[model samples]
Structure formats: structure tokens, C-alpha cells
Target: IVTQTMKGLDIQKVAGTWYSLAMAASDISLLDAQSAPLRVYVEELKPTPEGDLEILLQKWENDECAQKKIIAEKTKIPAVFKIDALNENKVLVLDTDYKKYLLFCMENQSLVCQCLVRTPEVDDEALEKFDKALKALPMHIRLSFNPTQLEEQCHI
Candidate 1:
């Protein structure tokens, strides 16, 4: 699906803690994993001397956390990232308010996309924004989200 990314995204502003509210994955394994509550934190987002963007991410894997490092080179497209670790997959920033919610998509045959918000409880405004931004993708590519699930998973 042809998805557009954010324009002139500021990495510094995007760096912070985020909670996964909903996810869409075509892979069975990923679907099972994302169906539950998840959390992610973006740490140490900085620019290298060579001008490449370096990113450190801590994502919760069930009860444990997994760390990942990615080096993203700037492309002509705004908010679009190319990570070599994913075989040069295109990571697109669909939408983000920096402090509220963030929606990102990665181009892959078996895509596992997700929506994250700052608060443990899902925000209505955030979900509205996510819905609007996600409309850019093909219908078959879209994932279902249940706000009630978020409420059930996290307190406060």
C-alpha cells in the first residue's frame, strides 16, 4: 500500500516513552504477540557525525524487554526511514503528535503495523487521529483496534 509519512519530523521531539495500544499484523506469530498489551520506548535518538540518524529502542516482549539499535539514513521522503537490519525496509511515520500518539508502518510483504499512545489508557483524540491517518492504507492492510482492550490491559 502507498502510505505517506509525516513532513519534517523532529527526532528529538519524537524521542520518549510510548505504549502500544493496537497493532495489525498479517503474520500469525506477530498477530498473537501484538494482540496483547505492549510498550515501547525511544531512547538515545541522535545524529551521527556522518549525518545518519541513530536510534535506540526498548520494546517490551511480554514481561521482558528487548533492545534494538537502528541507523537510518535520510532519504528524499520526509519521515521515511531505511533500516538495513530489515533488509532496507521502508519505515514510514504515518502520524504523530509527539506527546500524544504515534502511528508507524513498515513496508513488508508481511507487515506488522501498530499504534502507540503516551498514556496507558487509550485517548479518543489519539484514536481519531490514528483512524484518519490509517485510511491512507489499503483496506486489507488495516488492522482492528479495541479501545476496551487497552482499558483492560493497563491501569491508569
Candidate 2:
């Protein structure tokens, strides 16, 4: 789960510099460690009457920073808004006008998400089910196993 929810004001405040910590590759285990992760900076955000928000993702990067790398741009309506459902943490259920559902998680001051994409948006059939799962998460959970721990534990 995301340790910190994506706040609207924060979204607007920091309308750029979203970084993806994980490598942007299909083969997870085969990822090259040195390869930099992708980044998606916010381009635009607006309000709506449906109680939803509008959002835009644009490719951006700051080479000197070692983070903030973007390569694509996209938009959403009921946009990149957060929904604090039955949970305390706000969840961004980007119900874009482009017929896509994209989810993002920001925790602490780092990117906790393993997968970030700008592909064909998710379809309708899975929208409800996906939202259900997103809303059921806790504050935090282990995203990956520690490799160093595994190597040292073999002798135990």
C-alpha cells in the first residue's frame, strides 16, 4: 500500500518531478540494475462537478537530480484526483476522459510503485474490480523481498 496518499494541493504544488523507482522493463528479473527508472510529471489538473478531478501526465526529467525522467504525456478527467473512500489515505483513481484507469502510489518521499506505464488504458469491465482492490489496501506492505537477506540466510 502507499504510505502517503497523493494530495491534490501537493499534485498542484509539485506539478512535475514524479519518478518511478523500478526499472521500466517487461522482464522484471532481467532488469539491468544501472538502467534508470521512468518518471511521470504532472502537466495539468482541474476540478469537475462529478466530484471528480482532471489530470495530465507529461514526460519530464531533471538529469542532475537522478530522478524526474518523463518520456510521454497523457490526460485524465475526474482527473488525477484522489478519493479518500472508507480509508484515511487518499487514493488516486484517475478516471481519465480518455477511457482509461491509471493508479499511482506515493509513499514517504519516494516512489513505491513497481509498475508505471503510458500504454493502452484499462478497459471498463475491470474498472469496478480494480477500484475495489485499490480501496482495500492498508497503509503499507512489503513490495519486494530483500536480496541481501536471502543471501545471508542460506547458512542459517
Candidate 3:
């Protein structure tokens, strides 16, 4: 099937608790819990008054979840977003079923793509699509963040 930037991503369809099934990045430590101090936990999705995307995130530190709301500034391109809070500003909604999975890619120093599923387990379908999307990545995928994060509850 044709996988383009989920063009015209309807924010409403993305509302749910997302789980990170797999993550590919040149630097493995960036996604590691210890090395990457802040494990970004997304609670839900919504649209801002100005039409920007609102991501209610919890930056999990040692034992506390620093909850924050980051706005994805809307660009002329609907599927692409610029996150002012994170250095990796360019976030693309690579593809999604608007239900089961979401393929997201962010590029700055390195190109990182991740497969997110609503459930803790990675279904075969989602994994297949994730594998396919790897080839489409503009940059070389060096490593897969091994031992993916444990299924986390919304720990407030």
C-alpha cells in the first residue's frame, strides 16, 4: 500500500493511549531510560484553538512524571509539525490506521522512526508496516532501541 505522510492527519482520530512498540535511531541511548533521562509519555491528543496539535506529555524523570503540554505548530503541510520544545522539531505523521498503529518519524541530528501501537504488544500487521517504513526513511537506520520500554501505566 502507499504510505505517505498521513496527509491531512485528522487530530481527533489520534486520541488514545499510545504505546511505543519499537524505535529505530542512530543513537540507541537517546531512547534509553537511563541514558535518555526524559522518557516522553504521551497521554492524549487534541487540537489547539489555532489548529495546532496539542500533545499532553509526561516527561518521566527518575520517579516523577513531569507533565507538560507541547504544541505542535501547524505548518502549511498538515502532516508535518514543528515542535518548539524539542530540538528534533520536524515530526512527521508517517502513517496510521487511525486506530491500531501510528508510524512516526522525527529528524534533526538523526532520523528516528518509531512504531506505536495502542496495545502493549506489537501485532504482526504493525510490525510488517514498520519494517516496510524503514526502507522509506531518508536516513540510514543504524540501530533498534533494544528491549523496548516496559508497558507503562499513566503514572501521575
Candidate 4:
């Protein structure tokens, strides 16, 4: 079964300041016990014709260099990514796009992969919720695979 928040998972999408919560991988050391907070600012935000939104983020963890850390040093300044809204609040994301990737978020607050890498089988209730969320999108929107299918393919 899946439990979800009613609020948007990433409200901070627009250009603003944010601290690094953690890295995508648990193996990678994140804001450790002694580490300081890593700050990230949205450099730009623009709407696209596809009803998608794009953003550029700059990392600022140290004074000597901005957007030049291990996480983003190799990455170009103002990291760009796009997100397509499922609704005004919920969004289907295409981070870096080329990977044929997708993500879901609500109101830009609580961020979690709609597709799970490790979850138990779903029952009627969970299935219904999943369907509701999927069907909530416009007919033009295409989810080639379901969350479980994504988990099966992309799970660690």
C-alpha cells in the first residue's frame, strides 16, 4: 500500500534559496553530522508551450565558489530541468529529460517518486488510488507505464 501527502511535494520550484536535504543515493554522504547545509537557489523559471515548466538552479554551499561542489562542480551553472503539471498542484517531471524519466510531485512540497523501487503488492485500495492519480491527468498525457512497472524497471 502507498500513503501520499495531499500537498504538493515541491513548492520551491520557482527561483529561490534552498538547502541541500540530501543526495539521491543513501551511499553518498549527505549533510552529515558535521557537514554544513548546502544552499541552492533557483536561477530561472519559465513556462513552455507544452504546458511544461523549466528551471535553472545554482548551488551555493561555500563562499569561494558558487555551484562548484562535488555535486554540481561538474554540472553547469543554473542546472536546468522541466516539469509538466498533472494539475495545478501535481506535476509529472522530466528531470534532465534524455533518460526518458518521469516523476510526480504535489504543490512542490513533499517530493517522492510515484514509482517505487521496493514496495509490496497493491490491493484494491492502493490500486484505486493509483488509478485515480493517473486518470486525473488529461487524456493527452501519456504514462506508458504504471508506478509498479516503473519500480520493476528502475528500482535499485
Question: What is each predicted model's overall lDDT from 0 to 1?
Answer: 0.60, 0.31, 0.66, 0.28
lDDT of 1 by residue, 1-156 (tens): 635567777656766556666655445554444323223344445656544567675655656556767787767775777777536577677778788887776665655566777666757777677667656554343444454544433311
User: Model 4, 12-57: lDDT tens per residue?
Assistant: 3422322111122111222122222322222333444433354443
Off by over 4 Å in 1: 27-29, 33-65, 136-156
Q: Which ten residues in a row have the lowest lDDT in candidate 4?
A: 69-78
lDDT for each residue of candidate 3 in 1-156, tens digit (9 for 90 to 100): 124688668866777677666667645555555325334555567777676887776666666656678788878887888878546467788889888988887666566677777876646788788888776554433322222443454322
What is the Cα-based lDDT of residue 154 in candidate 4? 19
| Highest-TM-score candidate | 3
lDDT ranking, high to low: 3, 1, 2, 4
RMSD for each model, in Å, please? 5.0, 15.6, 4.4, 16.5
Better of 1 and 2 by TM-score: 1
Can you rank all candidates by TM-score, best first? 3, 1, 2, 4
TM-score of each: 0.64, 0.24, 0.74, 0.23
Better of 1 and 2 by lDDT: 1
What residue runs in model 4 are displaced by over 4 Å at the alpha carbon? 1-28, 32-39, 61-156
Candidate that would win on lDDT: 3
The regions of model 3 sitting more than 4 angstroms off are: 1-4, 33-39, 85-88, 138-156
